[PDB]
Amino acid sequence: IVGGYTCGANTVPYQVSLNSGYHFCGGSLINSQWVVSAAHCYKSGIQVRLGEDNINVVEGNEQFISASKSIVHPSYNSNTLNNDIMLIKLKSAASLNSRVASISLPTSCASAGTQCLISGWGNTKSSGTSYPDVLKCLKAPILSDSSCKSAYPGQITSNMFCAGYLEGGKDSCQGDSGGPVVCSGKLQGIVSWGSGCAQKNKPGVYTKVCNYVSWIKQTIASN
Ligand SMILES: *P(=O)(O)[C@@H](NC(=O)OCc1ccccc1)c1ccc(C(=N)N)cc1
Ligand SMILES: [Ca+2]
Numbered sequence: 001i002v003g004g005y006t007c008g009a010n011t012v013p014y015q016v017s018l019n020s021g022y023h024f025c026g027g028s029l030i031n032s033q034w035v036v037s038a039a040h041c042y043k044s045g046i047q048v049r050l051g052e053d054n055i056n057v058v059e060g061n062e063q064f065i066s067a068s069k070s071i072v073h074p075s076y077n078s079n080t081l082n083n084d085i086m087l088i089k090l091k092s093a094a095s096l097n098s099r100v101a102s103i104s105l106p107t108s109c110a111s112a113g114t115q116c117l118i119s120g121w122g123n124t125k126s127s128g129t130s131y132p133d134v135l136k137c138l139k140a141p142i143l144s145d146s147s148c149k150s151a152y153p154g155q156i157t158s159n160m161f162c163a164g165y166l167e168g169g170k171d172s173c174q175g176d177s178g179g180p181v182v183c184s185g186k187l188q189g190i191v192s193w194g195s196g197c198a199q200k201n202k203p204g205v206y207t208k209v210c211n212y213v214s215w216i217k218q219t220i221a222s223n
Helices: 145-151 213-221
Strands: 015-019 023-031 034-037 047-050 063-072 086-090 115-120 136-141 160-163 180-183 186-193 204-208
Touching: 015 034, 023 047, 023 180, 023 186, 023 213, 034 186, 086 213, 115 186, 145 160, 160 186
Parallel strands: none
Antiparallel strands: 015 023, 015 047, 023 034, 034 086, 047 063, 063 086, 115 136, 115 180, 160 204, 180 186, 186 204
């Protein structure tokens, strides 16, 4: 996250770290046994780490649970990043409480102008690299379909939205991928892609979760 603030330990109780020996992507807990992330984060051998604030230090609230199954969206296209979403089933159900909690799925798509909270342990610089050990947060508005398409001509599909600031300086970045964009207490987006981080006229692009709610519910109902 570039130009955000320190969230505070366990203030984002649905935030997940995906670990394969090191943190490589975020995710969101949507019920005690399922995590949603970006399909471009797919890897074999994932361990889900819940209750994290400092990812390099055991502070007492975490639960580490291995994934038993990963299901990438049937139409994920790795070249265009269309349908960049995947579900991960946990080997055991997590124990939910105030500090690790699930986020609910949306009943409606959020509109442009809605303020959201984006979080993750990704890079904090737009030039150079510095990975924080504690969770970072950014409040940012969903941008209009038109400004999003003008910033990325010929690349935005109906399954994507832009969020952030056209003047730059504040954005999600590498390592934040797969993480949550929550607006009005509901998961509306997944950190998916962008051109650099925090550059002028290149806002972050996010998977539009409201288009996938039927696929998520049907899939978790039979797996
Ligand atoms: P994420 O993996 O942390 C990163 N996206 C990623 O690199 O995959 C998509 C991609 C591939 C090749 C070039 C560009 C993008 C990511 C997530 C968000 C932003 C952002 N500026 N908001 C940037 C990179
Ligand atoms: Ca920790």
